[PDB]
Paper text:
Orai was identified as the protein that forms the channel’s pore and STIM was identified as its regulator.
To exclude the possibility that the crystal contacts in the H206A Oraicryst structure were responsible for the conformational changes we observed in the pore, we determined the structures of wild-type (WT) Oraicryst and K163W Oraicryst grown in the same crystal form (I41). Anomalous-difference electron density peaks for sulfur atoms of methionine and cysteine residues in WT Oraicryst confirm the accuracy of the atomic model. The structures of WT and K163W Oraicryst reveal an ‘unlatched-closed’ conformation of the channel that resembles a hybrid of the quiescent and open conformations: the ion pores are closed as in the quiescent conformation but the M4/M4-ext regions have conformations like those observed in the H206A Oraicryst structure. Therefore, contacts within the crystal and the straightening of M4/M4-ext are not responsible for the opening of the pore that is observed with H206A Oraicryst. As in the quiescent conformation, anomalous difference electron density for an iron complex is observed in the basic region of the pore in the unlatched-closed conformation.
Author numbering:
A (entry chain D), B (entry chain E), C (entry chain F), D (entry chain A), E (entry chain B), F (entry chain C): 148 to 180, 191 to 219, 240 to 327
The structure:
Amino acid sequence: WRKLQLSRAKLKASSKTSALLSGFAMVAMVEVQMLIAFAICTTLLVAVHMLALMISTCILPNLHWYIETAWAFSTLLGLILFLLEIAILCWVKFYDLSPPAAWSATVVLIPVMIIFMAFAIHFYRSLVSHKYEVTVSGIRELEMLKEQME
Amino acid sequence: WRKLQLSRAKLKASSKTSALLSGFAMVAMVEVQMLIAFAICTTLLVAVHMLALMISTCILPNLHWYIETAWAFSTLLGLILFLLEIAILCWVKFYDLSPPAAWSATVVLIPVMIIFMAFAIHFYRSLVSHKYEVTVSGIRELEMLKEQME
Amino acid sequence: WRKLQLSRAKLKASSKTSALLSGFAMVAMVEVQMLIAFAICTTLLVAVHMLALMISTCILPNLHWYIETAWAFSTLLGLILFLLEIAILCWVKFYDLSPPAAWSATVVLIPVMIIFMAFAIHFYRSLVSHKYEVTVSGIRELEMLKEQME
Amino acid sequence: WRKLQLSRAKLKASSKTSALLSGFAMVAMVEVQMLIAFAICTTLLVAVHMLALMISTCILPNLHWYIETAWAFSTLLGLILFLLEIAILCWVKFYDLSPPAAWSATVVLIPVMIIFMAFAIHFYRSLVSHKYEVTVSGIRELEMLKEQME
Amino acid sequence: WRKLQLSRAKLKASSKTSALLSGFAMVAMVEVQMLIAFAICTTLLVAVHMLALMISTCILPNLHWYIETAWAFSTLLGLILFLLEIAILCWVKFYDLSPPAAWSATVVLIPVMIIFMAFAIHFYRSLVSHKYEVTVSGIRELEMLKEQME
Amino acid sequence: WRKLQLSRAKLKASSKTSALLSGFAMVAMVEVQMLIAFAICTTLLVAVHMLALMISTCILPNLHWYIETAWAFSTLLGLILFLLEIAILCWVKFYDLSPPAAWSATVVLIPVMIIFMAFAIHFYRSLVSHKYEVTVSGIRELEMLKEQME
């Protein structure tokens, strides 16, 4: 039952978060209407969420770990892009009269971005260690029974 | 119970995702206000979601696999269109003074689009193999009982 | 329990879908600000969803089949209208400078609209046949018991 | 359990429907920026939903029929107003150059509005009769036991 | 179980209602861009919802009645403000050419506002009486057992 | 079961609240298009929510207290920023013709901000005391059994 709820909660959140970000980012682009980066960022950001949303639909009818990677990787990737998107927006909006303030947006972007990716590495690192930790402990216990077995 | 939740979760997500995309895409069009493609893409994109939403309503009161195809196919088709829609938007917004940056939008579109369709093929391919895999295994087990039966 | 969930899921989806479409369509109209059709379509579309939403509220406290017709009919009717609405929007937005592209919107509208209504007819047709199918089978079984009864 | 779900489903739908309508109607007003009616309609519409939303909050901690009236009456009243609001919007947007089309909006409004209120009367009328129907049937059964009792 | 659901339903509704109102009110302000009141009302309204949202987050990990007051008071306070906000918006939008219609907005505001606060007083008054009612009934029953006890 | 629901409810609310605020704040910035503060505030605000949303995704597959800190701290931090964001918006919008009224926005901001942070301190302070309160009571009870044990 715990596993069923995990997918259920993940399905709604992923769709809700991915859909809104795509729509708002899209509208944000039309309102204003580095130069090349803005176009590429918006397109890539939307595509990532779309592919992820598809995963929610394909999994419904239904290797499991492989597909899981796509959902986690895409959702995470999209979030980072959204962060990159807003930074560009400020640069684009202020780009006309506000160029002076525009720089602060990207400069302050680096700090949070680094911590964002760095924090993920630490969490993952600890997880990997646990996998190995259990492996050593598991075989150890079996040997205990095996030894006494003889 | 597992089957009931599958439809329940799919119903909300499909409606939430399809509805928002339709509304935002619609508004995105009015804000700005290849040339012909923009009009066709928007209309087709919305229609796909609408038909899908209807499926959610018709199934509520209630061959099952046939209807399922419409929901999965439409939702997937709409997502691809939304991706095509945003690419056109950038081309439309920048189309005036920004034509130079405009190309990057469509050029970067090809990459994601290919993977989008290609990935679906792989997932489906594996599924088809499983159907056959079970067929061979099933008849095999029955023969086992049949042979011993004699 | 299966019946309770059916209404519960239907209540949320109907409200979420009907509300958003009404709001977006409303805003889409103010942004731009055949000519007569645009005004009539928007008003009628919103009214349908409103009446439907009311059904969700009235049923909460609580012939059952009769009211059900209003919910299914209204929701379905509204969806078709939303499709008609977007087609008009393209015609309205492009109508000024965009006439070249405007036509494609309505022309491509016909295809999806036809299939939309046509598909509903097929599904309903199969359902009606089932109702008659059961009737024949039901009386048949009773006769079996009736004959042996004598 | 059936009663608990009734309130739970009603709480979410009421809040979701009332909140969105209030926000969109509010934004619709700022975009454009009979004359007096537009101002009064918008303010009254929002107030109705707000009071209703409060009901959802006040009932959470917790005569029951009395409060129920406020929720049903307010939600229903607000829906009717929203319908009146959109009609005014078309009249306001087109009011400048579009007056010819503006009339169709209000004219087509009367039809749906009438049926909207008229339909409610029929449903309520049937309900009232049922209450009396049970009253007569109930006393009748008791008399049956009373007569045989002697 | 009844208590758990009460908080669960309250958590989602509060967040959904508070978040949307804050966002729309914020956008409504940028679109148009008494004079001083408009600025103060918007800031205060948003702050109230934010603090409330925090309550939802802080309570998750977890005197209970004290915190409850903040949620109910803030949510209720915010709703009243939202009502005050829309009235100001009409006054602001029409303030230019529409001053004549502007007055009707605030004038019609008084009626609903009065009933809003007044209705709350009646509901609370009845609740207080019940608390005392039970107190008298409780001691009475105990005395009954106490008397017969001797 | 109580613990499972806690995370489930927290997951949806966090995503819904964080996503909407990010989108609206983003759009609010494009509509208008201290000077430097506006750019920094918007970028930082969005980044906080994004990192938080990631937490919802990473925890799904799965020290527990450590990660919990990120979710609570980020969500809370973002809310405060949103409050700071709106204050800047008023200052930015009125900044042109409205400078006079602009001050009232920030001045009235201080009051709510102080109470916002101050209130959290009191709640946390009481919690800490309880932790120590239980510690003293716990050891005390064990001694009772320990003494009688001898």
